[PDB]
Write a protein that binds this ligand. Structure first.
Ligand SMILES: [Cl-]
Ligand SMILES: [Cl-]
Lengths: 220, 215
């Protein structure tokens, strides 16, 4: 299957009392894409216990249970029923040694990391630590005048080439505005997408997500 | 009244399913001390809906609602029913400009900050921004061989003096092991305590806290 991740960030439409109302707009889909939502840290327990989809955290800490005021430990997430997290997003960047420590612990506990990077040097640097997914958010794909269907193909091809023959899947996390951008990304070697305001701030979130993941399949 | 804050940190005994069991058993306090609990960030929405005690966060961000992946905004806390937070704890220290931005927003929204500091220079630096509480955690009160009842009185007296006549209450957040330590702190001008493992990890948490706050 391909993978689509919808990041709720801290948007007013999809956090706090609005989390439940927002999620009622969607129904679990059986199909070629697995759908994963990323709720805010303050909503994560409610999503784990009572939500209808697979959920990943927005950020996770490597520290164990103990004297860690203001942390969100991986071992606590596992006990709530959460099986993965986004890490190093452009809005939540981390020191390199912190990222290495977290990737090493996740490998040991079979917890899934979606590691965000901004360029090919970062992508190569972290290769040997084996992230489950890489989410690519390069500056060349960010702008109102630009998208994957319009940009040079080398942007995505270079990162896919770095991870050729590893167990790591590549997702595209900038320049996704339509279904044509999604289908072109897969043609270039990506295995899915990471999206946010294009779904969350839509006048019809359900229809906006369906347009991105529609494949026009025949059934028997 | 005086104030006692019990910080749950991320201890196994008072997180997740164990949060619910811990709070079910713990008895409400009456008398001269008000109790406030500080649950982990992952437990905070559940604590707000429970409401058996007054609950403050362990850390808070100044960012509003919007595009802030992995943050815990003040405005989201307020909308859940949480009215205060600890800030700049020794385990969660912050840049000075971030602390100032947070104190200024809290003042505007009537949100209560318990600001942790480690020395008299830090205490004086933040005085003009009017924190509601100061929690003092100095190196001289940290150790298995040290406590308030055996340390020099000047340690606490200097910080009380800095905040004399302001609206800020001074709490002692290190060197508190027995009732004798609490009574000596109040004798030196403090208005309460911030404690953690001594209550949370106890075989009988209710009784351990009562032993500290009997006067
Ligand atoms: Cl523990
Ligand atoms: Cl918003």
């Amino acid at each position: 299957m391909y993978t689509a991740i919808v990041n709720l960030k801290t948007y007013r439409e999809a956090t706090g009392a609005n989390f439940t109302r927002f999620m009622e707009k969607f129904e679990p889909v059986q199909g070629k894409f697995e759908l994963i939502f990323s709720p805010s840290l303050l909503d994560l327990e409610k999503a784990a216990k009572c939500g209808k989809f697979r959920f990943f955290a927005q950020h996770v800490d490597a520290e164990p249970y103990g004297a860690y005021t203001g942390h969100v430990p991986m071992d606590m997430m596992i006990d709530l029923g959460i099986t993965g997290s986004i890490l190093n997003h452009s809005e939540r960047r981390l020191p390199r040694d912190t990222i290495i420590n977290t990737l090493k612990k996740a490998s040991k506990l079979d917890f899934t990391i979606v590691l965000c990077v901004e360029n090919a040097e970062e992508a190569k640097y972290f290769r040997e630590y084996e992230p489950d997914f890489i989410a690519y958010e390069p500056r060349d794909l960010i702008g109102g005048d630009v998208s994957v269907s319009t940009a040079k193909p080398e942007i995505i091809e270079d990162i896919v080439k770095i991870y050729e023959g590893t167990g790591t899947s590549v997702l595209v996390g900038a320049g996704i505005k339509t279904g044509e951008d999604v289908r072109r990304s897969i043609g270039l070697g990506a295995r899915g997408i990471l999206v946010a305001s294009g779904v969350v701030k839509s006048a019809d979130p359900t229809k906006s997500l369906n347009s991105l993941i529609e494949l026009k399949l025949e059934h028997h």
